[PDB]
Symmetry: C2
Subunit: 69 residues, 2 copies
């Protein structure tokens, strides 16, 4: 429910920018992009873990409204 | 005459080190390698430009010793 797509897009754009800057002979700006990508990946992993942990707390039982729908 | 090779051999090591560092996810050390490569290329170009002037200035007279040899 719109939790991980936004983080995935931020990783994708940073990866594309780093790939574009590699061929441009821009080594000074690549370290910041690499650090930002690593931080984004760590945050994405933490968000995925905390999202999948919260689902096990409750049970997705079936009520009479779902069958009627 | 130990003037062109001594500088040409210094380019391959720097290029290989930069290529290895790029694939090693180490973008912090690449700036120094790029700067050193640029400085070495400038020095090599200046040496190559100044080396041919002496050869062009002199005349390659064909002596009779070469025919005998």
């Amino acid at each position: 429910p719109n939790n991980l797509k936004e983080i995935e897009q931020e990783i994708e754009k940073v990866k594309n920018e780093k790939d574009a800057a590699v061929h441009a002979q821009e080594f000074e700006n690549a370290a910041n992009l690499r650090d930002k990508q690593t931080k984004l990946e760590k945050q994405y992993e933490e968000a995925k873990n905390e999202w999948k942990n919260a689902q096990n707390g409750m049970s997705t039982s079936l009520s009479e409204e779902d069958i009627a729908e």
